[PDB]
């Protein structure tokens, strides 16, 4: 009942309006500390080059007119909340393909008696990055994630990290491509200085045998049959049907890796 | 023009325009002023469907402001897409001339309440963007009235005739030209003499290629029963012949 | 005028509240007659199984707080309301593919002086329908239609066949199928007693023409080469090409049947 | 605390309209500097002859009806407002694919106290543009991109550009297509005078690897064998072979590049 009295008394309209941002004196910053922990990495399309991965990403910051006195309301620490209806600092994909840029649910966000809230949505997102293709198929991709804030700059809200390896003791196991290592940093532009973002990196690798198994043993036994035509003797009548069935195997080899790899 | 759906989807600008009542005024008392521009959820607006619908929006969804009049006449042209369906006629396939049609009409209102007139009989292309696929030949609009199952009033509707044919290059160039070609190598087996040893591969692979071109024909006509391509038939007498 | 102080009349918020049903003398059933009526099948689509058809779906039931006496309001007998402001049961289908659960229009609906309510909107409607698959091309297919409540019971409203068929003089020809009959019944069910939906039965037909003479006749043309390679003597060394052309044929044309029919 | 007094005493609805315009002295125009900036060529597909690019597009007009000193409150000279709630230009594309005319988002506008309004959304867009094949894949496109108004005209609205080039800062390089230039022209007909529209045009050069790997070698590999039936003696019995194979190899790349290709 009392919760109830108090979430009347907090997200009242005429006391708290929504879209502007919690400062007090002559424009202060707000921080707003994040970091990522991943859930599973579904799929690297390299036909199109996309990455489609499942990340829940922790905001914290801190706002200074969510207070309550709470001996007043009968030793309440911690409420929940709506999060449509709080502040939110945007923050959003920066490199993504596909036009999707909030975040997937819009959970409930944790307020304690201080102000700092806790938050934290889960999304699936499908992060555009660039594959490269020379050790086909024994590579180490790399693919990169930008999280930017969206409406405001440098010199409004300012991201800090928290742990320089985004957490994965949550992640379950991805069958073709294992994870070797992924960190993240922040970067700021000294030119521009409009200009704060983080970005991870994730740095994955093949694992390399089915691909093995299906284009490179059938293109091995086709390409030993090259050199064996000239060990035919000439008067069986039968040259012509070898060299120009190699040759029409070996074109077809050619477009079906071409259809593997990108345009690139 | 999708042949395999049997579809047609335009992008059209629907131009609407009526009287009301309520909606007048002396421009003398109001600092003359003529025309104003409000949106288009304030105000009664009537209710057109098209009655042809596949997969299709069933009226007009992007609400672009409405123009109103002192006198009452407002104006409104609100943007759509349609995704019309036509039936589709494919005999002669290389020059084919096709009639695709649209129906609009009011839901809800019959000729004692609303009534169309239509306003200049062409569809007015000053802005086409030419498709170079396909051209138009005509477009009219012929005005109708129909008496439906439920009720006993009649109403009137409106129905769009679109004329098109295919200007026929592409596939002169990439497909008659390679089945006509290799249609004249079926009857060269018999002067080629028997104690060579080839003669049942070009039986074999000129049965095989008109089967490859048969079955690659079958993807772009519909697969309608009421008529047969003309182009499959000489296909069908050929492989008949070659076998 | 008159029509707009009855308009008015009829939709005081505080008066009439749509989120309540129309019962009268301790709780009746309000009575649902709905009938059918297609405008033409668009697809019936094999290898998905889903059958796209676009129908008309008339119903009509009786309301008892939305009447006038007609004297007062100068001879008016029937108004049109906008639709989805006052009460609708809803009546959707069941047995959907792709989650389009209710109509697709909201169109006006006529009030009589009565109570009486009827209502027309249309759909497009993508139900999925169990192929038979043997006697391909020469089969005749059954699709259902299920037509059910959605939050309501069999203690509160009450659904009732209008006339036995579905309705077809408002329909064009659908070429490639053509229909046989279309039944509808009334399922309750006597075990549940909560249990009440409507299920029409498209009896439909492929006409054979244009299977047969891409498909069947190739077919034949190629099997009529299986018994010929025995008439053809040994010494000119040309049976083998006969024979394996045969059988590289019969497997492409084999695959390609596999890939028209569903995987069932 | 101060910026909600100023976002209360600017959009009163007493003191502010958002149906009107900015208009007074007899009929003056305003002016919509609009400059668009480029963030990626996602994708130029040839095959239905379409373009998906991601564009902010900024624009700038100035409203007189916002308007404050900033000593009464607290020296702000700049604000954010929501996008709705005040006037807007309405700036469409013309030539557009799919029915998806305005922006994505709606994001925040940064208004100053002059009154003069910078807003920039993002958008991607599916223009449509005449595919020009004549040297492919050496080819060099050229895909234009209309802006026009949707409700004004020219004797309310007047737009006018900024500078003669879009904004490259923000693109990343792409992959398969490279810009070469993006001129921007102001068109006007001379015998409506009710005209104005902005198109930008955009010329494109493919990089020509990809499509050279797959089907330019094995077409002069496969061509280089036409004129070598003759040379070969007819004892053997070799002719057939070779001369058939030959012309089914060209049938297929000849149907390959009926695939790829637009149908024009
Ligand atoms: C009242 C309410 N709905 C109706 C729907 C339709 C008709 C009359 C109606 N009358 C026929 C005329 N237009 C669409 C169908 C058919
Ligand atoms: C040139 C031509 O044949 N036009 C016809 C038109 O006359 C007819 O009204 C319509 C519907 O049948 O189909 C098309
Ligand atoms: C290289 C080339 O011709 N580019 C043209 C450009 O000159 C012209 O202004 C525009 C409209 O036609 O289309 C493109
Ligand atoms: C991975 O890609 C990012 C983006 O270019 C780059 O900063 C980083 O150095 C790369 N690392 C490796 C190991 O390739």
Redesign the interface.
């Known amino acids: 009942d009392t919760e109830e009295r108090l979430v009347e008394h907090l997200l009242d309209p005429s006391r708290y309006?929504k879209?502007?941002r919690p400062a007090?004196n002559?424009s202060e910053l707000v921080t707003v500390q994040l970091m990522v922990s991943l859930a599973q990495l579904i799929s690297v399309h390299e036909r199109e080059?996309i990455m489609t991965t499942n990340v829940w990403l922790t905001q914290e910051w801190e706002d200074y007119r969510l207070t309550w006195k709470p001996e007043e309301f009968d030793n309440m620490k911690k409420v929940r909340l709506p999060s449509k209806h709080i502040w939110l600092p945007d923050v959003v994909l920066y490199?993504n393909?596909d036009?999707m840029?909030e975040v997937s649910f819009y959970s409930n966000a944790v307020v304690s008696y201080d102000g700092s809230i806790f938050w934290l949505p889960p999304a699936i997102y499908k992060s555009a990055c660039?594959i490269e293709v020379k050790h086909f198929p024994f590579d180490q991709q790399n693919c990169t994630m930008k999280f930017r804030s969206?409406?405001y700059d440098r010199t409004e809200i300012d991201l800090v990290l928290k742990s320089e390896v985004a957490s994965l003791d949550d992640f379950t196991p991805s069958g073709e491509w294992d994870i070797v290592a992924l960190p993240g940093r922040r970067n700021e532009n000294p030119d521009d200085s409009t200009y704060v973002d983080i970005t991870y990196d994730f740095i994955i690798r093949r694992k390399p045998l089915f691909y093995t198994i299906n284009l490179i043993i059938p293109c091995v036994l086709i390409t030993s049959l090259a050199i064996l035509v000239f060990y035919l003797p000439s008067d069986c009548?039968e040259?012509?049907?070898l060299c120009?069935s190699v040759l029409?195997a070996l074109?077809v080899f050619?477009?079906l890796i071409?259809k593997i790899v990108?345009?690139? | 023009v999708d042949e395999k759906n049997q579809m047609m989807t335009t992008n059209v600008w629907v131009k609407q325009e009526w009287h009301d009542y309520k909606l007048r005024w002396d421009p003398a008392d109001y600092e003359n002023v003529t025309s104003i521009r409000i949106p288009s959820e304030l105000i009664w607006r009537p209710d057109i469907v098209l009655y042809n619908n596949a997969d299709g929006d069933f009226a007009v969804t992007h609400l672009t402001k409405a123009h109103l009049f002192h006198d009452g006449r407002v104006q409104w042209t609100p943007p759509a897409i349609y995704k019309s369906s036509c039936s589709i006629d494919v005999t002669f396939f290389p020059f084919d001339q096709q009639n695709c049609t649209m129906k609009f009409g009011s839901w809800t209102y019959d000729k004692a309440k609303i009534d169309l007139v239509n306003m200049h009989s062409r569809v007015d292309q000053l802005d086409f963007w030419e498709s170079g696929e396909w051209v138009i030949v005509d477009a009219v609009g012929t005005y109708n009235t129909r008496k439906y199952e439920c009720c006993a009033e009649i109403y009137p509707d409106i129905t769009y005739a679109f004329v098109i044919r295919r200007l026929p290059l592409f596939y002169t160039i990439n497909l008659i030209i390679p089945c006509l070609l290799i249609s004249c190598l079926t009857v060269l087996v018999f002067y080629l003499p028997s104690e060579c040893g080839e003669k049942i591969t070009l039986c074999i692979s000129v049965l095989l290629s008109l089967t490859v071109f048969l079955l690659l024909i079958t993807e772009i006509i519909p697969s309608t029963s009421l008529v047969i391509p003309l182009i499959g038939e000489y296909l069908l007498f050929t492989m008949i012949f070659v076998t």
Chains 1, 3, 4 share one sequence.
Do not use: C, D, R, V
Request: charged residues 10%; proline residues 8%.
């Open positions: 309006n879209l502007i007090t002559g080059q490199n393909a036009g840029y660039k969206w409406t009548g040259k012509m049907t120009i029409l074109t050619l477009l071409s990108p345009p690139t």
